[PDB]
């Protein structure tokens, strides 16, 4: 559990406080850049390199049958496990656009071929969704499950503006959480179904969740309605029966009062939280290991790496995990004149 400050050489403006990372077979690609692409990188996705404390970026290309994708901001991300029919997809939906609008669209990401020289070819297939489709929303959550042995993917959460009827020129940035309703989706075909639960008293957003072996745990976030960060846990036992995938759930004693954290994987279901936000003004700052088992979820405090006084005194902080128990974060840089590198950069690890 160590942190090291980094300094990116030739990249200092493209990332924004809300962005994303995606790993395919150990290969890291940044997703979500500030604004539309220039003439430089018409894809906006960057293969990332962290070597001798230096941070480099390189541009990616795609196939021709692969449609291109605008830079979403805070969508739900889901690694589709490599299996039939098409390994190895990685799901993207649906976030908000550079133009402050929402996508409400499903993209599947995949690798195609390589190289030649460390070059990797990728692809994006927009798949239409049939329903009973979900509405446009962002900051939501979605994960995959298997039911003997069918494969489905379920979404819930997210914020959105007021409905267009009351959409008001003075409320045009006012937003509320989505209704407390999940949406089950088969990937083939693009079916979508909406479902509410009696225990599901209220919608939410920002929340992270982990699925495994037909059951999911919905973990802590924050609800804007009551302005509360309820530290309970949600846990839904779901299954796919022909043709009604019935779904039950329960509330455990305690989850955690955290908001929009950085979750790294280390094992199958041994994961770790690098801190999100406990209070609206006060950041939670320590780690927390969480395993999930068929017996249940098992969580324990850990030793937090020795934070820099600066990262201790940032007002904001964010990022994702480089993977396998390693993460990367950035801090808004304070200086007049600006560096103008708007962020210090740190690299954290465990053990």
């Amino acid at each position: 559990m160590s942190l090291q400050p980094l300094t990116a050489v030739n990249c200092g403006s493209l990332v924004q406080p809300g962005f994303s990372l995606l790993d395919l077979e150990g290969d890291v690609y940044l997703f979500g850049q500030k604004g539309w692409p220039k003439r430089s990188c018409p894809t906006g996705i960057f293969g990332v390199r962290i070597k001798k404390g230096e941070l480099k970026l390189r541009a990616i290309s795609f196939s021709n049958n692969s449609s291109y994708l605008p830079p979403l901001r805070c969508p739900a991300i889901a690694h589709f496990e490599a299996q039939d029919g098409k390994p190895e997809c990685y799901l993207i939906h649906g976030g908000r656009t550079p133009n402050n609008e929402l996508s409400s669209s499903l993209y599947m990401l995949s690798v195609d071929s390589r190289g030649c020289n460390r070059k990797v070819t990728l692809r994006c297939e927009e798949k239409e969704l049939v329903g009973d489709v979900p509405s446009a929303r962002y900051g939501h959550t979605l994960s995959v499950i298997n039911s003997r042995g069918k494969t489905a993917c379920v979404l819930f959460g997210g914020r959105s503006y007021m409905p267009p009827t009351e959409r008001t020129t003075q409320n045009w940035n006012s937003v509320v959480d989505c209704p407390p309703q999940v949406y089950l989706i088969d990937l083939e075909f693009g079916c979508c179904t909406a479902h509410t639960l009696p225990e599901l008293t209220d919608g939410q957003s920002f929340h992270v969740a982990l699925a495994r072996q037909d059951c999911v745990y919905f973990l802590g976030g924050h609800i804007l309605s009551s302005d509360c960060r309820p530290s309970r846990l949600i846990r839904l036992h779901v299954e796919l029966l022909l043709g009604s995938p019935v779904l039950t759930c329960t509330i455990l004693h305690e989850g955690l009062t955290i908001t929009s954290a950085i979750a790294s994987p280390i094992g199958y279901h041994e994961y770790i939280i690098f801190g999100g936000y406990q209070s609206e003004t006060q950041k939670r700052m320590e780690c927390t290991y969480v395993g999930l088992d068929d017996v249940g979820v098992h969580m324990e405090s850990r030793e937090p790496p020795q934070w820099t006084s600066e990262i201790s005194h940032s007002r904001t902080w964010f990022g994702g995990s480089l993977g396998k128990g390693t993460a990367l974060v950035a801090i808004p840089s304070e200086g007049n004149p600006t560096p103008p590198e708007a962020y210090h950069f740190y690299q954290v690890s465990f053990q």
């Binding site: 924004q16 406080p17 809300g18 500030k34 604004g35 539309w36 692409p37 220039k38 003439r39 018409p42 894809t43 290309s61 795609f62 021709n64 049958n65 692969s66 449609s67 291109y68 605008p70 656009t97 550079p98 133009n99 402050n100 927009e126 900051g139 914020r159 267009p164 009827t165 959409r167 008001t168 020129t169 003075q170 409320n171 045009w172 940035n173 006012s174 937003v175 920002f206 924050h222 804007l224 908001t259 929009s260 936000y277 609206e280 003004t281 007002r315 904001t316």
Partner: protein
Amino acid sequence: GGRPRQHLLSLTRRAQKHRLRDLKNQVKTFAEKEEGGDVKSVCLTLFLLALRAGNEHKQADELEAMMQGRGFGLHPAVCLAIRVNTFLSCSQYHKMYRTVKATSGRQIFQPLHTLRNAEKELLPGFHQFEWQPALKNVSTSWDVGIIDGLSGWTVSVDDVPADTISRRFRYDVALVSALKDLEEDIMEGLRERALDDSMCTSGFTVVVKESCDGMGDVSEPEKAVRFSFTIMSISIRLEGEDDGITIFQEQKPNSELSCRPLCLMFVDESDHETLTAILGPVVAERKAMMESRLIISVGGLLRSFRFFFRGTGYDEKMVREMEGLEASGSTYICTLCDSTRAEASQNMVLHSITRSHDENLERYEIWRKNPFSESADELRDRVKGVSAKPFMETQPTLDALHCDIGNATEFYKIFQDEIGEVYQKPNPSREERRRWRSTLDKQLRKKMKLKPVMRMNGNYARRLMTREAVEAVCELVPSEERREALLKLMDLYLQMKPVWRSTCPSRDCPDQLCQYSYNSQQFADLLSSMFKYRYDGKITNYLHKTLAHVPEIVERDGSIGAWASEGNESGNKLFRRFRKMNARQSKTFELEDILKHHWLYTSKYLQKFMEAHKN
């Protein structure tokens, strides 16, 4: 005995009443018995007739101008206006007020309370109205005032922060404010048209141009944009075959005094996120506005109003950045046709207008799906460089000012290369180029008496594109053939400079428009003949535009200098002058005040008082 009784006018008003009580109650009872108890009118007529009995006609007429005639100096209006018309702060105004009150009694000016309230007569949100049909997705509240651009931007640090400080008015409200301002001249244009007024209360036609352009050098973050707009003209569509008679037409649109700001935000011009995040509601109301009919008590008569808009007031950079095209120097330069780079050099005169906002949407859709499963550059070419999603409709038109600026800088470096011999030396060196720069600088310092600048202003441009500057620098280029070449070049250029610089070319230089085709073709062919040295396949976008687009656009619309956006640039100077003098200063109030002041600055209802009684 008795104390000597003094002159009634010199006694104390307490003692004056103590001694006058008798006739006081007498006049009281006379008013009550004969004139309905109106003592005021009774004593007014008493003094009036007593004065007019002594041949005091002048003082009686001045008194009659005082009673039932608003004397008391001149007016609240001109008072507040003059306060604006010289940027005087409030404490200063009151200091002058009390002064001119004490010395030279009979105060002329108004105190602070009178003008504070008088504001709300010309502030936005004062005249009532409504829409038919009702305005969609818009609150019908009509008495609102200033709103920070957050539009309910939730401040959740978990989400994107509310770190941006902004103010704005409600679009319709400033619109109706400007119209109610110009109800005066609309009634006067109805007069000049000898036109009915009880009738023709439905077919009014109003057109507005707009603009938005940030600026740096605001400190001691750092940048802000001043989104503004101004009415251009208004005509009559009723009742048939008559297409339209210009009832009002603007005379000085490029002028600052016609530039109505609407919203300001402490943001850079670059980051497309905050700009959209703020201006969104403006776009929604804009598009929701084309349809409904507005009801206004114009000339006391409730009449309807409809609106057409033409987005013009944007620099090339912003024009693109709200059109999602390649910014800036890619193979697609014509923001109207689909020319390549070298094709605009291949043929420099035969281009049409194709780039249409709706087709921009349609082809961004093709980019989005790629229904033909094509490669990156393959689909980019098939789509003709439609790279991003469009965001807002602008009329595919040109800015005269920065096109002139491009002509200026291009001829500037032409001179810098003609002092040296680039047609002999195709690859001269950087330091020799800087020496040619400095000798051109000293040459135009001696003749034409001009100093160097690192970046150019408009006067630099105009004073540069002159045949006198040509013949002044031509003394340095030795080849008398290249001299005559670029001499005829500048000649044919000026043969058309007013064509785009004309406010009404249909009248101001119609023959200059007629031969424009031949002049521009001569220009391009002269390039290909003697100046192809530089224009093999590389050109500047502005030239491209001034060659193959001027007559088309102007014939389709009427002018260019009419839709020119110039004002905002020098108005940034005014914005700075306002801020550093009248600020509170507090961030939540800086704009919240400067916007008021600024909007006030541009009411004809005031500016006439500067020019109305002056000629």
